[PDB]
Each structure stands twice: as C-alpha cells, then as structure tokens.
Amino acid sequence: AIGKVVIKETGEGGALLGDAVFELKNNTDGTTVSQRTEAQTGEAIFSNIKPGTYTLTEAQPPVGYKPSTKQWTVEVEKNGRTTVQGEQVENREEALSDQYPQTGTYPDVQTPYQIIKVDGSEKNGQHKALNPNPYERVIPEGTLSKRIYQVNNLDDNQYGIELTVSGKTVYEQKDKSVPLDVVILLDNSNSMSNIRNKNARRAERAGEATRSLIDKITSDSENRVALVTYASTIFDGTEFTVEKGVADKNGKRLNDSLFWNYDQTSFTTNTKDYSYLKLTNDKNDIVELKNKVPTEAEDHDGNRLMYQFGATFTQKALMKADEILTQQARQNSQKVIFHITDGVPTMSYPINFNHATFAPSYQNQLNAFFSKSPNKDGILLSDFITQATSGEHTIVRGDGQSYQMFTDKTVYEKGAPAAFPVKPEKYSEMKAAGYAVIGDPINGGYIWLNWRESILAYPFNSNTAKITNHGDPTRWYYNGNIAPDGYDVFTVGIGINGDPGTDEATATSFMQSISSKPENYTNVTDTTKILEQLNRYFHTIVTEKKSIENGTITDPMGELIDLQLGTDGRFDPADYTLTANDGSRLENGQAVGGPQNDGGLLKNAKVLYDTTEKRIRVTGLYLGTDEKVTLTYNVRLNDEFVSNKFYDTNGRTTLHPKEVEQNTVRDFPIPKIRDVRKYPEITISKEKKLGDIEFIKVNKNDKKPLRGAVFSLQKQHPDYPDIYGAIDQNGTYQNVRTGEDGKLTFKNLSDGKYRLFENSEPAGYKPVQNKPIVAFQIVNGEVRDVTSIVPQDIPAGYEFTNDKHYITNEPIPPK
Ligand SMILES: [Ca+2]
Ligand SMILES: [Ca+2]
Ligand SMILES: [Mg+2]
What we know:
- The chain has 815 residues and is mainly β.
- 12% of the residues lie in helices and 37% in strands.
- It has nine helices and 58 strands.
- A hairpin with a 2-residue loop joins strand 39 and strand 40.
- The structure holds calcium ion (2 copies) and magnesium ion.
- Magnesium ion binds at residues 187, 189, 191-192, 312, 342-343.
C-alpha cells in the first residue's frame, strides 16, 4: 500500500510532454492499473503500490512521438521501497505525513507520558523526531532521563541520545518507626559578626551549615524542625528591653559609654525575627524557616542600638528548646537539640533566694533546691525567677560583661579604681540629678564607678553560698529541667576559649555539661568545618544509605535503530561518553578525575555493548543526592525503515537502582525517529516519429506490378505555399525507378505537404511525362488526406484497395 513510481517524458531538445499513457501490472496476480501523464506537472504518477514485482509499459506515447520498445521491471519491497530494475533514475524528495503519536506508556506502573516534536528535526513543515515530555522522570531513588539532545545529520537520520540518572541520600534512624523532632539553637551574639575574629565569617558559615543540616533532617518528610536564634534574648521579632551601664557608689545608674548619654541606661526595640518557633515538616514552612536563618550578626560597635541586644543568654535559649519539645514534640519521636554557639553565658536568670529575716542560710536554701531536682544535681525552673511584671531586664543577671559575677563592686582602670570624669560644664547638672559627684563647678570632678547590682555575685554579702558566674546557674538549670528528659543534645562551639571572664578548660567543662554527654560537645576552630561537625553528630543518630547502589542501566537499541560504532564497526570509547557532575569521566575506558582524582562517581562504572542483543549496559552506579551521571551516544535510523513510520530509539530502557534488588526496575521514557522514503522518477527521452507511405505502380487492367516507372516526391516549400520542390539537395526520392515489385517506398518523412509526380511511364504504357499523381500530408508523423491530383485525361490514376495505395498505368492498346 506504499510503493510509488513517477514517469516523465521529454522531446523537442528537452521540453516536457503531455498525454502519455502507462500501465502497471502485477506479475503474480495479473491485475492492472493504468495512469496518464498529468497536465500541469507533466508527470505520470503511480501511488499506493503493494509489495511485489511489476511490469511497466507505455500503452500510448504522446502525439508526434515514437512508441517505446522498452518494458520496465518495478519491484516494491515489503517496506514500500520502490526500485525500477537496471535503470538510471532521479530519487525525488517526498513530503512527510502529518501523523504523530501523542503519548508513550511507562511499562513499570502503566502511566501515559506526552511526546513532543524535537527542534532541529523540522523538514518542510513536518518533524522527523519526538522526545518525551518531560524527558526527566522523578522516581523514588532520584531522577532519570532520556532524550534526543541533538540532531547530528537530519537528512541522514543521525541523532545524539542522552540518558541521565541522579540519586538520593536516605538517612534512617536506628529505629524506623521513630521519626525525629529537632530544635536548632543558634547563637547570633555580636562576636558572630562575619568580619570579626580576623574575618572568620562566623555568622555566615554557621547559617549556611544550619540551612544544610535542615535539608538533611527534613529530607525524610516525617522529621520535624524548629529554629531558635538567640543573643541577649530570643530573636523572634517581639519588642524587648535590655539594661546597660554602671552605677555610682549609692547605686544610681549611669551609662559610661561614649556612644550614649549618661542617662541612657536601657534600650528598647523589636529584635530581628530569626526564629521559627514551631516544629514543622511542611515544605513551604521549611523554606520560610531556612530564610529566617541569619547569615549576619551586628557588625558595628556599641554606637548601634542593636549591639545592645547581642550578649549570650544561653539559659533562655535552652529554655525555649525545652518548651518547644515539651509542648510540640510527638510522643513517639526521638527529640534532639543541635546548639551552635561561639561563647559561654554572660547572662542568666537568678535563683530565687529568700531574703526574709528568719530565712535559712543561703547554702541550706540552695541544698533544698538541689534536693527537688530529679538527679539531686540541679535546680527546677520554678526555683529561678524568670518573669517579672516590671520586665525581664529588671530581674535578669548579667548584661554581656563577663561569665563572672563580680565579688568586688569596684570598676578598675589602669590598675586603680575608675571614675567617670565630669567636666566643669556638667558638674551642676550631674550633681542635681543626684550622682555622687566629687569636685566643684570650677574644676569639674568625677564619679567613682561600681558595677551595677545585677552584674555582681548574689547574695553579695552572703557568708555561705554565693553565685559567682553565669555557668553554674545555667548548668544547674540544665541538670534540673533538660537532662531528665532523655533528649539528644549536641553542642558545636565556634572558637570557644572562655572570653569574656573565664578560661578554655572551664568553658569546655561548661559546654559539655549542657550537652547530653561530654562527647556531644565539640569545639570547632576552623569555621569552614561547622557543617562537618553537625553532620558527624547527625550521623550518630542516623545511618546514611544511597538509593543507587551498584545500579545498572539497560538500554537495548529499538528495531531498525543502529548504534553508531563509527568506521571500525566496534564499540569503543570513541562511540560514547560517560561523565558525572563531580567532574569525573570515562577516558579511554578508564575512570579518571573527580575532586579526589580517583575516578569519583565513575570509579566502578563500565559501559558495555552486547552485539547480539544490540544493547548498551551501564554497570556500577553509586549515587546519592546531587550525584548525577550522563551517558551520550549516537544512533541512526536503519536503511530498511518504513516511510513515515515512527520508530522508538530504544527497546525497554531500565534502571535497576540496586543489583541487590533485581525486581526493582524503573523505566526511562523513549524518543522516536522517522524518515520518508524517496521515490524513483524515470525520465524518458522520446523520438519524434516520422512518416512513411508506400505505393505500388501497376497495370490499370490486371493490377500487376510494373518495373521501370520513374517518380519524384516533392515537398511544399516552408515559406511559399504554391511551390513544391525537391526534399533536400542530395538526391532524395528524386527519379526513383520501380523494380519488379512495382514499389515506391517513402520513409523518414518530415511533417508537411507532399506531391508525388510520375516522371515517366514504363515501356509499354501510355506516356505520362512529369505529371502530378498523388497529394498527401504528414502530420505528427502520420499520413493524412491522401488524394489524387492526376490532371483530367492523363492515363495515370490513384486507387486505395485492400489497405494498399496503388498507382495505375494504362497499357498502350492494340494499334
Ligand atoms: Ca524539661
Ligand atoms: Ca568505534
Ligand atoms: Mg558570642
């Protein structure tokens, strides 16, 4: 139903000829179809020719032209390939059909995918190739993809094919049915400022590490995360007040900073909102939470208001993590805190000592507090003051000055008690405001400085127990209210050395005591290794497994699709590429490169080609999240294609993510290519036909043939009408003398008007001396209008009898 052959006829030098008539007959059934050279195009076209062998014959030629003595053989193959046997022809461009399949179906789970036209495959308004869309498929193990990624040679049906595979990293808890509920506590104190610490980039690196840890925790959709950012308070967007400054010896407060007036003893503002105080596993919420992670801290000194909020109130942060897990964690979940900090506490909530007259000794009081804690080693939250109607700043201990709570109220400078200078012009004002000014209005004076009450040890005059640093209460807080809960608590310190107010050994002991075991604190000195350390602690509670583990791609070529092996006809490294996104590659069959220069992701990958099965396999794939391999190779549509028909480039194309699981198979989507077969066009050069006509000279009476008559054939002159002359100047058909058969035979005669003259009768016949006998015309090489022109009474005649032209002579009668 798909064979085709076209015949053109030329003539006059080479102009195109109309009206020819052809026949195509099937040599096994005898069936016939006939076709006529069409009017405008000058072509005779046979369409829709079925497989088999044919004879093609010219039934009639155009008017004017000789018939053809030639019969052509026409074989149509099972695929519609039309050949005219042992004959030179032009093969002509054929138009592509407008039929396209619209979908493929994934065998594995039986779902449709769309199919679209490939750019660069357009040929005259139609397309030769189709890609799946999308060409990349999401799978539980990552993604896979297959497409034509380039057209190498459109006219020759040559394309480049690309397959990719990307993996997934899976974290599994020691108990699968127990997901994680995680709070991250993140220090945003001023010391985290990126330019501080010799440009250590603390904030940005701890922030980038936090974001990456969130990605790892939440890659399992069951796990939930929350984020607490802290410094002098929880950074949550709410309005907050801090106090600053020192005091004179009667306790009248004053800010000795040169950035502020002496009466600026408190600061109020909204903090930045760097917290996400809700455990969540919703993807949109997680996006929002990671955007709240700070990558800066306050860069300026104390001339900025926000600097006043950037000390280290560790207890309050630990409190917020315990609150979130207590209030929001699931019953059956592993509860975790990751705490990233760069300093020891410099603020804490006061232990609620009783100062009434008959109250027990401070040590007795404290021992009773320890006695209520679960492990007899800490203080319950209800035995601290953590709220006040006048505000937190009125009860909190410390302000960022030191880990110590000073046991001497005196501020020292240069080896001696320090005084605030009061110039003569401020003497009256500071004296009237109620400060203990020493000096006078002429010379000015000074105000001896003391640390304010809330920065000192308390109870300050105790003869028994006395709290002298912010670590002890924070640690007792932890032991009393966090340790009995069974949380995993990991602490990553950044450059911790005990500044301000203590040393590296106390700082280390303290950070260990607010982690769930001492190994669960690590101090990082290189800020580029914060993520590595968070990751290490992550890996004590999960095991990591890659989803593609000695995976295999199996990629059979489609029916009538040939893998390009180039001239050697052998599959070798010139015929494919295999690269991966760690920069590794197969090079001459060997895996090279990657950041460790060991072949990286491709270290164990092989590309094989089974020549019997026409199939590529890629073995040895090991891929986690963001690990991706690419295979490319070239194919060509086989010469035996069926015209217009789309061929899949591959058979069933599969990824087995794990050789360990032989029945887990994922399908790749499949491209298609086609071509339209050219048809044979025979051009026939036709010969103009020329006229012929024969007369028999005979006796009038008995119609016997006569020898010895002489005739001349005249032709009308092309210019003048009344004027017949010789045909050429050689001697052609001039004085032709008849033989015993009587025949006058004319052939190869051009078109036009002719007059046959009898020059002389034969011996024994009435004289006929140069007389016109017959007129006729040759038109389109045929004899027309054969008429007698014998003059009246001349004894010659013309007769037409039993299909023959006769010229008669009358014998001389008896004397
Ligand atoms: Ca608790
Ligand atoms: Ca090769
Ligand atoms: Mg700090």
